[PDB]
Design a binder for this molecule. Structure first.
Ligand SMILES: Nc1ncnc2c1ncn2[C@@H]1O[C@H](COP(=O)(O)OP(=O)(O)O)[C@@H](O)[C@H]1O
Ligand SMILES: CCN(CC)C(=O)c1c(NC(=O)c2cccs2)sc2c1CC(C)(C)CC2
Ligand SMILES: [Mg+2]
Length: 331
């Protein structure tokens, strides 16, 4: 099979932390794939805790670094017609949204496709067209955005319906690890020049959900899906009907009421201790993502952490949680 791949990304210090002359309690060694955490009191004499992962990215890591090393190869596996999922897990403030979506460079310096602050989602969407136009390709791309807040479901892309309309989920008669979500719109991305405006209506729906729901950005989970239908007409006339799906999953903040977050953890524990009963059905998140958790999807986790000492307790919690998950076997 294939173990879940787990990478760590430490955010850099911000303006205020630099101004307070903050010293990092985290040391990342990408060559050894190690993160070392200062856990005791002192700085010239110190107990430390180290963890090995599949990859480690320190505070210096840029969006392009993450894209080249992590996204690209997974996108290739999607294009070869397989299912893949990437989770972002970590405490609020550590760069889950930064990693998955990214931000705009200030002062209108760049356009969306060349912005260095762009995260996984736009980079993926751009590259799918850039690579698939390049070869002989009859292909189609569809996106959806399903969000979970308090075990209720929301479509954050659909220009027709408004965000406050809850959706309903049902089991899928013709798919065992699968569900049907009534009212979730899949949107056809016809070409690379439709991408941004589709994202923009999403960004607007996000603001309304934040107005409607308490701490929505921290307590919600989003599942951004992109589906590629391929019948590549290369240069021979060949065409094999392959379908690839990519779920980009921005989890609710892990910091110490959230049934989906509680159930993800118990599912992970069941899977790693190989308990016969895995409680998938105990939350919306784990039903929707059942195949990503010990199923037939290639799954990666990006665990985000802080360099600051103030965050020590939550950083260790994140590291231990993520480390456990390396033992999950997928197919
Ligand atoms: N790798 C990074 N590089 C630069 N800034 C970052 C990084 N990770 C997080 N940040 C910053 O930290 C703050 C919180 O990041 P955000 O993506 O909102 O985290 P989360 O979604 O996990 O709460 C933002 O100001 C963001 O710019
Ligand atoms: C600038 C605001 N934007 C882009 C519309 C985003 O916040 C955003 C994303 N950002 C981006 O697409 C980019 C950042 C920098 C260059 S392009 S990806 C994404 C959203 C919102 C969402 C609800 C549609 C989910 C996926
Ligand atoms: Mg966030």
């Amino acid at each position: 099979g294939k173990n879940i791949q787990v990478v760590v990304r430490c955010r850099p210090f911000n303006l205020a932390e630099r101004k307070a002359s903050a010293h990092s309690i985290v040391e990342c060694d990408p060559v050894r794939k190690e993160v070392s955490v200062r856990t005791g009191g002192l700085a010239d004499k110190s107990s430390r805790k180290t963890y090995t992962f599949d990859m480690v990215f320190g505070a210096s890591t840029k969006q392009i670094d993450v894209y080249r090393s992590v996204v690209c190869p997974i996108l290739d596996e999607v294009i070869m017609g397989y299912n893949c999922t990437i989770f972002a897990y970590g405490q609020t403030g550590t760069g889950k949204t930064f990693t998955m979506e990214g931000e705009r460079s200030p002062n209108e310096e760049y356009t969306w496709e060349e912005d260095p602050l762009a995260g996984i989602i736009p980079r993926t969407l751009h590259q799918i067209f850039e690579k698939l136009t390049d070869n002989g390709t009859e292909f189609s791309v569809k996106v959806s955005l399903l969000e979970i807040y308090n075990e209720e479901l929301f479509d954050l892309l659909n220009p027709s319906s408004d965000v406050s309309e809850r959706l309903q989920m049902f089991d899928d008669p013709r798919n065992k690890r699968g569900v049907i979500i009534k009212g979730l719109e899949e949107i056809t991305v016809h070409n690379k020049d439709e991408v941004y405006q589709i994202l923009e209506k999403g960004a607007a729906k996000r603001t309304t959900a934040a107005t409607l729901m308490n701490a929505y950005s921290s307590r919600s989970h989003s599942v951004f899906s992109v589906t590629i239908h391929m019948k590549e007409t290369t240069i021979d006339g060949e065409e094999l009907v392959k379908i690839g799906k990519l779920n980009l999953v921005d989890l609710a903040g892990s910091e110490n009421i959230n049934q989906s977050l509680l159930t993800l953890g118990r599912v992970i524990t069941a899977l790693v201790e190989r308990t016969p009963h895995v409680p998938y059905r105990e939350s919306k998140l784990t039903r929707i993502l059942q195949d990503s958790l010990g199923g037939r999807t290639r799954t990666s986790i990006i665990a985000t952490i802080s360099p600051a000492s103030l965050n020590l307790e939550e950083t260790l919690s994140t590291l231990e949680y993520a480390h456990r998950a390396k033992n999950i076997l997928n197919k």
